[PDB]
């Protein structure tokens, strides 16, 4: 099986800028007899099926704008866009069409650059309604931050807690180009009632210190 | 135009028969290879294998040798992939795709079928209001949507009339059921004087729940 490596897996861009996305393969895709390289490129947008951009490393599929350009040879390939447009904000992955089984890269996601923004952190205790049913979910929203990289940690009465933490992230905002994250610590009511102090802790580039929201059960 | 028509979503019970359909039109069904392609949640694409509908010859990826069975119904020009012994590991989007004529890349794709493998019963959501226990110019309110099955749920605020300042997060798997949350950010001077209610529609359980967010006592 031929292995396809696309690094890095995301790029932050201004519109109008040239971007170059890399694809390496574990075996040369060059055919010596015809001197052609057997790599395809695809564009995918969330909730949509992939779209053919390039085949034989550098041939644009008809209908594909000429700002899209494929290049390289052997094990090293690049997809460039000369002026990145808003509609070009998508996932792009390579596929060797050299030998079966066909194989794809993990893709490179193209994202919009914007000023660093600190997350807005809100922590919410369990509602009385959940409690009477033997469940205690503590919710933490970390909203409208940039860049996307964030680490959230929970503390119960001083101790880090990992079991029962479930996290969810939004794709970049089409309005303000920020990212948002939801972190939920789910305990039994029995464990929730035995502790006082609940803290949600954010590590983000925008701060030297944890961004922290906590409540006491009293 | 070439068309490859796949269903939006199939729910398949463990140790049961995932038979996925790909209806072809606008081209000679019997002339070209049809591939199946796997996309696990944000994990990149896996080629499962391909079948030639002229005679039903199947070349599989070695990875899917004991897992995938490919067949063809020439009279309904439809391609079937069947997954044996399916687990939650096989929950993914499954695309069918056509080679660009005789060339081993994909000009034409189906919309894909979201396959969920699970033994969960249809369960409506529990909706919990998230209200603030501190003063600022803005205030964030929420809804925790917990223990529903299957996907999807639809969340609006004030029946769609609040849309700015809304973050509805993708669902996570919790206890073989789905949990999800939604935050809304409004001016502090306006809450709770102007009411804020989250609406959660779960079509599969034929259920909708509304929770008005009231201040904590």
């Amino acid at each position: 099986d031929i292995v396809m490596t696309q690094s890095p897996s995301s790029l932050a861009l201004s519109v109008g800028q040239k971007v170059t996305m890399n694809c390496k393969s574990s075996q040369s895709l060059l055919n010596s007899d015809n001197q052609k390289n057997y790599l395809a490129w695809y564009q995918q947008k969330p909730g949509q099926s992939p779209k053919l951009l390039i085949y034989f490393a550098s041939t644009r599929e008809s209908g594909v704008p000429d700002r899209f350009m494929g290049s390289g040879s052997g094990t090293d390939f690049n997809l460039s866009i000369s002026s990145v447009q808003p509609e070009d904000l998508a996932d792009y992955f390579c596929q060797q069409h050299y030998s079966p089984p066909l194989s794809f890269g993990a893709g490179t996601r193209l994202e919009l650059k914007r000023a660093d923004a600190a997350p807005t952190v809100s922590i919410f205790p369990p509602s009385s309604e959940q409690l009477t049913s033997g469940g205690a979910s503590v919710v933490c929203f970390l909203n409208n931050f940039y860049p996307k990289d964030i680490n959230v940690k929970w503390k119960i009465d001083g101790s880090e807690r990992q079991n029962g933490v479930l996290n969810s992230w939004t794709d970049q905002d089409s309005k303000d180009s920020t990212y948002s994250m939801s972190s939920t610590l789910t305990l039994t009511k029995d464990e929730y009632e035995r502790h006082n102090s609940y803290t949600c802790e954010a590590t983000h580039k925008t701060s030297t210190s944890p961004i922290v929201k906590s409540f006491n059960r009293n | 135009q070439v068309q490859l028509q796949q269903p939006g979503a199939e729910l398949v019970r463990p140790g049961s028969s995932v038979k996925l359909s790909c209806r072809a039109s606008g081209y000679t069904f019997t002339s070209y290879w049809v591939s199946w392609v796997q996309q696990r949640p944000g994990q990149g694409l896996e080629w499962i294998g391909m079948i030639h509908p002229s005679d039903g010859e199947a070349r599989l990826n070695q990875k899917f040798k004991d897992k995938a069975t490919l067949t063809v119904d020439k009279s309904s020009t439809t391609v079937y992939m069947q997954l044996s012994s399916p687990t939650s590991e096989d929950s993914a989007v499954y695309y069918c795709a056509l080679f660009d004529g005789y060339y081993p890349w994909f000009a034409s794709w189906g919309q894909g079928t979201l396959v969920t493998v699970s033994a969960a019963k249809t369960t409506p959501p529990s909706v919990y209001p998230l209200a603030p226990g501190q003063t600022n110019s803005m205030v964030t309110l929420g809804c925790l949507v917990k223990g529903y099955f299957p996907e999807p749920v639809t969340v609006t605020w004030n029946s769609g009339s609040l849309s700015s300042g809304v973050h509805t997060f993708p669902a996570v798997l919790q206890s073989d059921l789905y949990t999800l949350s939604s935050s809304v950010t409004v001016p502090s001077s306006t809450w709770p004087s102007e009411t804020v209610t989250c609406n959660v529609a779960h079509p599969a359980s034929s259920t909708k729940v509304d929770k008005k967010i009231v201040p904590r006592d």
Binding site: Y98, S99, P100 | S54, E57, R59, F99, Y102, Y103, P104
Partner: peptide, 14 residues
């Protein structure tokens, strides 16, 4: 036909 234009003829049906 069943032939596929892979770079090599091994397992191409060509």
């Amino acid at each position: 036909q069943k032939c596929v234009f892979f770079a090599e003829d091994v397992g191409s049906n060509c």
